Coordinates of C-alpha atoms and ligand atoms in Angstrom, one line a residue:
X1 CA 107.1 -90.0 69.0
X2 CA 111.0 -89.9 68.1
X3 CA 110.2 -90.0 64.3
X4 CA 107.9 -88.4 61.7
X5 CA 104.9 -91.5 60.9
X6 CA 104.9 -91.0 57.4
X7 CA 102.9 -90.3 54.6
X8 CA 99.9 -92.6 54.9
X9 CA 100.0 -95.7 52.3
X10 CA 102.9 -94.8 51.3
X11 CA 101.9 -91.6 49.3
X12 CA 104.9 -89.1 49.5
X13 CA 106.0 -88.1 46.4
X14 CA 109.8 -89.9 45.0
X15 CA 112.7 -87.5 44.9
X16 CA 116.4 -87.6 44.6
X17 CA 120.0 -86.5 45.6
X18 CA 122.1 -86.6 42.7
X19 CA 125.6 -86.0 43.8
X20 CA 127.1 -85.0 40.5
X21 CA 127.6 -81.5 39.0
X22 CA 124.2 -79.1 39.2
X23 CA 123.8 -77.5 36.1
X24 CA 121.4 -74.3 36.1
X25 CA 117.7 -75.1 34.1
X26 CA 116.0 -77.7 31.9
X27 CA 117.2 -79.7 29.2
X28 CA 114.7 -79.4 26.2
X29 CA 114.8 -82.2 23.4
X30 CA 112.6 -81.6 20.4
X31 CA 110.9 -84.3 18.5
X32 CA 108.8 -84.5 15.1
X33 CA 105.0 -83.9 15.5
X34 CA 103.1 -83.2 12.3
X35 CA 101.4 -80.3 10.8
X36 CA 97.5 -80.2 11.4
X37 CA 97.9 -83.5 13.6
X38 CA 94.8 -83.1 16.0
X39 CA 94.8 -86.4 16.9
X40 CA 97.8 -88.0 17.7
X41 CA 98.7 -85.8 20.5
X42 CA 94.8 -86.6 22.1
X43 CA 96.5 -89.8 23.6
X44 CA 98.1 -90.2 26.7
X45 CA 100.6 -92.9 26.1
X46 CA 101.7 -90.5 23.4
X47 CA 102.0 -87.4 25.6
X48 CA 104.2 -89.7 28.1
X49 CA 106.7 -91.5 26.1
X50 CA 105.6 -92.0 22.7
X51 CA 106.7 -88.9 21.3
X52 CA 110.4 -89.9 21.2
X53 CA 109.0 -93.1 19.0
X54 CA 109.6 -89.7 16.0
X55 CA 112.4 -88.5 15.2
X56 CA 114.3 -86.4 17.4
X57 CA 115.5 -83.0 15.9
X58 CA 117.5 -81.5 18.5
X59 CA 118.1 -80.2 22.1
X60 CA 119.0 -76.8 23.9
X61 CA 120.1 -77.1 27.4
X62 CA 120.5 -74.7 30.6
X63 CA 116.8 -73.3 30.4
X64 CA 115.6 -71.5 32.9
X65 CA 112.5 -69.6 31.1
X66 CA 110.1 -72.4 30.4
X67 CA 106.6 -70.4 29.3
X68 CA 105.6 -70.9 25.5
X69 CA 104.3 -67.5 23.6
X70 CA 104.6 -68.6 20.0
X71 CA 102.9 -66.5 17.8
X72 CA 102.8 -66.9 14.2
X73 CA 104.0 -64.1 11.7
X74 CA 101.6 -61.6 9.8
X75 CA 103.1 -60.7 6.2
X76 CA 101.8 -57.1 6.8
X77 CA 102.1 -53.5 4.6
X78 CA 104.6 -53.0 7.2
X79 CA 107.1 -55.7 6.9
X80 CA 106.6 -59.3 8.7
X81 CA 105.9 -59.5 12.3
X82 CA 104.4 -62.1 15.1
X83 CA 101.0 -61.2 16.1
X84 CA 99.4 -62.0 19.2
X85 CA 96.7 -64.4 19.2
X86 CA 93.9 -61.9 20.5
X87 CA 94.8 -59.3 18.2
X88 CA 94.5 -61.5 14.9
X89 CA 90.8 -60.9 13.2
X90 CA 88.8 -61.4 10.3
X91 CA 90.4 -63.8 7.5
X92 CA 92.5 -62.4 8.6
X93 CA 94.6 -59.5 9.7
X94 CA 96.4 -58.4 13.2
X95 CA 95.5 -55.5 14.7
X96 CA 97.9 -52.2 13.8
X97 CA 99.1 -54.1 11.1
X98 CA 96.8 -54.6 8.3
X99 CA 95.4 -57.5 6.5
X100 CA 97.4 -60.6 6.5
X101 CA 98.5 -61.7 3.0
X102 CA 100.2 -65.3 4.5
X103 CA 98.4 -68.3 5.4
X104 CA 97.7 -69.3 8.8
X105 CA 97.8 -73.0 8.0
X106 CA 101.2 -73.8 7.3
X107 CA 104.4 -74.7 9.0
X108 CA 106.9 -71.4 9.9
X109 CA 110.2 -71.6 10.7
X110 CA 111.7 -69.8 13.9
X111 CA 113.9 -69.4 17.4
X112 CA 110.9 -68.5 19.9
X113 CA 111.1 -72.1 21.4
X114 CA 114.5 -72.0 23.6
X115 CA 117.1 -70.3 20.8
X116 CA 116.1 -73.7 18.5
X117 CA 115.7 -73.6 14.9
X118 CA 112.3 -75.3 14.5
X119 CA 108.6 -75.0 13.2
X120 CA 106.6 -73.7 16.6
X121 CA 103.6 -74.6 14.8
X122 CA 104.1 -78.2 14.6
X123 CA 106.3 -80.0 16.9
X124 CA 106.7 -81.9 20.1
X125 CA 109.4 -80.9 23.0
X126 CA 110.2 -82.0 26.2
X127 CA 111.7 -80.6 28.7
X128 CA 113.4 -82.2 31.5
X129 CA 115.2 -81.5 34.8
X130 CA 114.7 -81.5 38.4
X131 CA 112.9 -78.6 41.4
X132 CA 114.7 -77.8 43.8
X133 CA 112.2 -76.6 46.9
X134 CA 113.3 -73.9 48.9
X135 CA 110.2 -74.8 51.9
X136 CA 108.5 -77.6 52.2
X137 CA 104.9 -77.5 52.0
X138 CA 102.2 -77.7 49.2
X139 CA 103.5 -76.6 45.5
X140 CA 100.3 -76.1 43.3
X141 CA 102.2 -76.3 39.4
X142 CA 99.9 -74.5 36.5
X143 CA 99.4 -73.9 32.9
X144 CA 97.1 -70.8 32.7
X145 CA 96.0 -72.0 29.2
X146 CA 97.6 -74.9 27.0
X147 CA 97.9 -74.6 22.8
X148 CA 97.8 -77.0 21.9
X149 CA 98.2 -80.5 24.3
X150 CA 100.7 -80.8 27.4
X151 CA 101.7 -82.7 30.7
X152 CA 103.7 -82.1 33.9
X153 CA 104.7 -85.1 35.8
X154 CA 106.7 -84.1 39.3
X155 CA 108.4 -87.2 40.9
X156 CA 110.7 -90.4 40.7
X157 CA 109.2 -93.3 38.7
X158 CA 106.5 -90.7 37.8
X159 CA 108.5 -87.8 35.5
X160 CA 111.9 -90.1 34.9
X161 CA 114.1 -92.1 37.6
X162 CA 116.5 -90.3 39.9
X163 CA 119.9 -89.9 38.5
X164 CA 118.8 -90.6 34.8
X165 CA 117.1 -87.0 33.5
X166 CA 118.5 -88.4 29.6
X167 CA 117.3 -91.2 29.6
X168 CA 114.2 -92.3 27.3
X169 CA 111.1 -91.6 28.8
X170 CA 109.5 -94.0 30.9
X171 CA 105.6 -95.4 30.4
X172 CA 103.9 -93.2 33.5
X173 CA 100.9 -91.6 32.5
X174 CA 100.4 -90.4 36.4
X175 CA 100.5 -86.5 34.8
X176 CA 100.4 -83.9 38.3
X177 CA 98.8 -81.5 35.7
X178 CA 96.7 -83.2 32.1
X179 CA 96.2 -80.7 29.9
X180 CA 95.9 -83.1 27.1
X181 CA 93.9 -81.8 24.3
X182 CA 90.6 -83.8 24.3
X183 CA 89.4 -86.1 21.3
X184 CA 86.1 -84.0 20.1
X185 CA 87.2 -80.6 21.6
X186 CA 87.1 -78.4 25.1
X187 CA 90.1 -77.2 27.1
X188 CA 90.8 -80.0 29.1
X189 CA 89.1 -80.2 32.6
X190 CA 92.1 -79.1 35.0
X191 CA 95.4 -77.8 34.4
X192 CA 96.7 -77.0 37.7
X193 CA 97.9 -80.5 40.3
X194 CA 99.7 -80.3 43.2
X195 CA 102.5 -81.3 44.7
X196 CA 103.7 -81.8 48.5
X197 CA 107.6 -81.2 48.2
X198 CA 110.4 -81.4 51.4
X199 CA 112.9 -78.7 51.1
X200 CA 116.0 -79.6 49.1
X201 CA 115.7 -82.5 47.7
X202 CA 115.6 -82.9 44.0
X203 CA 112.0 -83.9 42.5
X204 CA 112.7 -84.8 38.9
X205 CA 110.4 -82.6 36.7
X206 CA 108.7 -83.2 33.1
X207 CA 106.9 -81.0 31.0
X208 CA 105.9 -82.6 27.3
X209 CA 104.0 -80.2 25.0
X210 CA 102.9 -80.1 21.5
X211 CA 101.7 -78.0 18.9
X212 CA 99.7 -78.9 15.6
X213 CA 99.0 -75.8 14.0
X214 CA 99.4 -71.4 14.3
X215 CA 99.7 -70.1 17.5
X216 CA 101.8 -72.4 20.5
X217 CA 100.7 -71.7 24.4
X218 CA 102.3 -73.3 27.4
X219 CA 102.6 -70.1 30.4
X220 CA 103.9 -72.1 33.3
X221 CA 103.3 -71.3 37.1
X222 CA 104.0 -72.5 40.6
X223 CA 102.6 -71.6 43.5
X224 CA 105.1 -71.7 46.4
X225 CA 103.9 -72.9 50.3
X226 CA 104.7 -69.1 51.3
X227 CA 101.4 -68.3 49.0
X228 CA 103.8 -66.2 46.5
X229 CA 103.9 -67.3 42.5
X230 CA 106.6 -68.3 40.4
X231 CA 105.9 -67.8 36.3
X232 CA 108.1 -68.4 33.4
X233 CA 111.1 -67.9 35.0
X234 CA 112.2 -70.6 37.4
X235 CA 116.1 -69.8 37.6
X236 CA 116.8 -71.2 41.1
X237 CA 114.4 -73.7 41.2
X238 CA 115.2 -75.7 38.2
X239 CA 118.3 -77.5 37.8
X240 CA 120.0 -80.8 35.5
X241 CA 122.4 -83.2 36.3
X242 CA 124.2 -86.0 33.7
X243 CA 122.7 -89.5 33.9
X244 CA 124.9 -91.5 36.9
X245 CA 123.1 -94.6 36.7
X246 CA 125.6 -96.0 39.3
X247 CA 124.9 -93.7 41.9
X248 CA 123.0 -96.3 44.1
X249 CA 121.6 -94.0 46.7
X250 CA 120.2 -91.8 44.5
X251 CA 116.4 -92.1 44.7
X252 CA 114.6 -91.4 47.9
X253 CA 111.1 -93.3 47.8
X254 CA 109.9 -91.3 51.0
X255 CA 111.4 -88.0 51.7
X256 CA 108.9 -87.7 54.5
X257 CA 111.0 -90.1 56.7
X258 CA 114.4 -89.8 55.1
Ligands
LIG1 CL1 94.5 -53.4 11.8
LIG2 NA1 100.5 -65.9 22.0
LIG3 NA1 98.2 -74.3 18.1

């Protein structure tokens, strides 16, 4: 027939063609999330939208590495310095450094999220922007562990709306990948979701994640529809673009027929 049918029930996945300005990587906005919290970050709503409800701290722009690796500091014999989750032991030490004289339990100060001043341990970010597919076919997006609750949401009316990556974030809790922490403990069940993309169009992209306490995890993956794997660094695949919330042909509901 002289045309593609369409996904069935209308089921292809919202993207967009902003025509303004591309701007390499992700826009990440910080907001407050509170030491030893296990709970508040355990609801969806929260993980969706309400996190901007707290105060927002800050933002870095123009990020293309998007993998978390925070690792708390051991006050060693040998000076101060971040120790790798597997390697910390005991009550405790880290391994080729010695007992640890400082307190795993308590908000630290530092730049490993994105350049930003912050406390790893205990805050909420997210980070916003849109993938650009090289080929169509079947992206499967990952988070090879998650510490200590996150979300990826791939698509118009499903990550943000087409054309308007700052505005607040809107109430879908439709998450490609839930790796919310569970109430009364576990990993949660699946953290890898899947996504059919059309070559170059823009599919709006958000990741929230939050921490509560020591250690921060978050190593982000994509497998591409050529089979290959994309991890941590996703220059040329992530891009931003200001709000244009006049831009009325922005959103395309079904790239499968547009
Ligand atoms: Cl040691
Ligand atoms: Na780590
Ligand atoms: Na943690």
């Amino acid at each position: 027939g002289l045309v593609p049918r369409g996904s069935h029930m209308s089921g292809a996945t919202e993207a967009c063609l902003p025509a303004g300005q591309r701007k390499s990587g992700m826009n990440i906005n910080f907001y407050q999330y509170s030491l030893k919290d296990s709970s508040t970050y355990s609801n969806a709503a929260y993980m969706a939208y309400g996190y901007a409800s707290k105060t927002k701290l800050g933002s870095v722009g123009g990020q293309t590495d998007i993998s978390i690796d925070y690792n708390i500091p051991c006050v060693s014999s040998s000076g101060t310095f971040p120790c790798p989750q597997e390697d910390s032991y005991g009550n405790w030490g880290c391994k080729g450094m010695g007992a640890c004289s400082n307190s795993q339990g308590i908000a630290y100060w530092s730049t490993d999220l994105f350049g930003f001043y912050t406390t790893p341990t205990n805050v909420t970010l997210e980070m916003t922007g849109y993938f650009l597919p090289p080929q169509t076919g079947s992206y499967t997006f990952s988070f090879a562990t998650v510490d200590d609750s996150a979300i990826l949401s791939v698509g118009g009316s499903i990550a943000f709306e087409c054309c308007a990556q700052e505005q607040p974030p809107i109430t879908s809790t439709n998450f490609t990948i839930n790796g919310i922490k569970p109430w009364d403990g576990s990993l949660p069940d699946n953290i890898t979701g899947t996504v059919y993309m059309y070559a170059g169009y823009y599919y709006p992209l958000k990741v929230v994640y939050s921490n509560a306490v020591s250690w921060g995890t978050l190593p982000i993956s994509v497998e591409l529809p050529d089979g290959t794997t994309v991890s941590d660094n996703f220059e040329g695949y992530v891009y931003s673009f200001d709000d244009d919330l006049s831009q009325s042909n922005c959103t395309i509901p079904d790239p499968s027929i547009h």
